[PDB]
DNA sequence: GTTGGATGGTAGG
DNA sequence: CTAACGCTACCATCCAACC
């Protein structure tokens, strides 16, 4: 099969300088003001003028404004972003019908049936960079190749603004060429798990049993490696299920009394619930920010569904399971409902 | 014991 | 208040209850 994966290139800043023409060229940082002081914050993301110097997505704001003070600081609008994702998915939706919508920014469409060649399929990659250039004024990044994975890898290389294939004379180089932390699902802690044994390329892991590969990084890690480097890997395009909605918010201070933590809460579930949408779910979480920042979960299943009523009673009663089981103080709160119908 | 839950981790550049 | 927002998928661990 031929997969084409599409990300959209510093999405939220592209949006709005498409809505704002005169910020072209310079520096913007959509932000996140969580208002407990003034510019208390996070970066949610910064077109590539303000990455040259360092504003990278997570970053504090008060130490961005440090780096660039003269950058344009626009707050996040999630909500004319969505929008925007909507209306290019359903230009993607005219080349194939199987796409797959990994994230906000980007998709996989199984381009195998349209195409037979690479050539054929990076033609049409250039089409779909046009069609949402002159419908969207968006540039997007496409990547080419047999599977999923390498689909990603493609764009990882090519973006910003880029097309890039990888066909086999590729993928089987890469497999004993591409540094392991590469390898998309592969992040840190997996970086450290693998060097120790010596393992820095896909190759590595066929010269190697499988029954300790699966005692240091996990079984379901391994195979999916063990199964990249075979190059048997086949892991179809198909339609997204949301299986999770959630929100969680911040407090202007942080806070143990559940007086104080309560009205935050409330927020979360009302956008929640506002979020699911015709959707009903089995099972409801209370999450916890804690004051140095761990993440602290509280859940239950309920045999049938969880109506609204049902989700303001009950995430109070894990709020104060969590307030009991830890001491300490809460910075963010917010819920989670799962197990839909 | 064999699942499906509860909690947490790792990753998504 | 003194830096750290926001979102979801999926796997691993411990563990409690049916074959
Ligand atoms: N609030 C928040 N939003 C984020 C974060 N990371 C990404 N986003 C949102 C804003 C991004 O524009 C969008 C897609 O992220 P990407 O990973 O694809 O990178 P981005 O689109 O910013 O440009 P990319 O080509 O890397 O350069 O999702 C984050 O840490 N926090
Ligand atoms: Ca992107
Ligand atoms: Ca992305
Ligand atoms: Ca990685």
């Not at 066909?167 to 497999?175: A, P």
């Not at 896909?202 to 300790?212: C, G, H, M, N, Q």
């Amino acid at each position: 099969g031929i997969v084409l994966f599409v990300d959209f290139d510093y999405f939220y800043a592209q949006v709005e300088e498409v809505l704002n023409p005169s910020l072209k060229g310079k520096p913007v940082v959509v932000c996140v003001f969580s208002g407990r002081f003034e510019d208390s914050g996070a970066v949610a993301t910064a077109n590539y003028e303000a990455r040259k110097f360092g504003v990278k997505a997570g970053i504090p704001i008060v130490e961005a404004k440090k780096i660039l003070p003269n950058a344009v600081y626009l707050p996040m609008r999630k909500e004319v972003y969505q929008q925007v994702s909507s209306r290019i998915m359903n230009l993607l939706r005219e080349y194939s019908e199987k796409i797959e919508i990994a994230s906000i920014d980007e998709a996989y469409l199984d381009i195998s049936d349209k195409v037979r060649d690479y050539r054929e399929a990076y033609n049409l990659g250039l089409e779909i960079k046009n069609k949402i250039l002159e419908k969207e004024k968006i540039t997007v990044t496409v990547g080419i190749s047999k599977n999923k994975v390498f689909a990603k890898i493609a764009a990882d290389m090519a973006k910003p603004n880029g097309i890039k294939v990888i066909d086999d004379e590729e993928v089987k180089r890469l497999i004993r060429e591409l540094d392991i932390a590469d390898v998309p699902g592969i992040g840190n802690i997996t970086a450290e798990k693998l060097k120790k044994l010596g393992i820095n390329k896909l190759v590595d892991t066929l010269s190697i049993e499988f029954d300790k590969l699966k005692g240091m990084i996990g079984e379901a890690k391994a195979k999916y490696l063990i199964s990249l480097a075979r190059d048997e890997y086949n892991e179809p395009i198909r339609t997204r299920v949301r299986k999770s909605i959630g929100r969680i918010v911040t407090m202007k201070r942080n806070s143990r009394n559940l007086e104080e933590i309560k009205p935050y809460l409330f927020r979360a579930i009302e956008e929640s619930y506002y979020k699911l949408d015709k959707r009903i779910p089995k099972a409801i979480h209370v999450v916890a920010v804690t004051e140095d920042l761990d993440i602290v979960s509280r859940g239950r299943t309920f045999p049938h569904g969880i109506s609204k009523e049902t989700a303001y009673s009950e995430s109070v009663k894990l709020l104060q399971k969590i307030l009991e089981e830890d001491e300490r103080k809460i910075r963010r709160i917010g819920v989670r409902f799962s197990k839909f119908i």
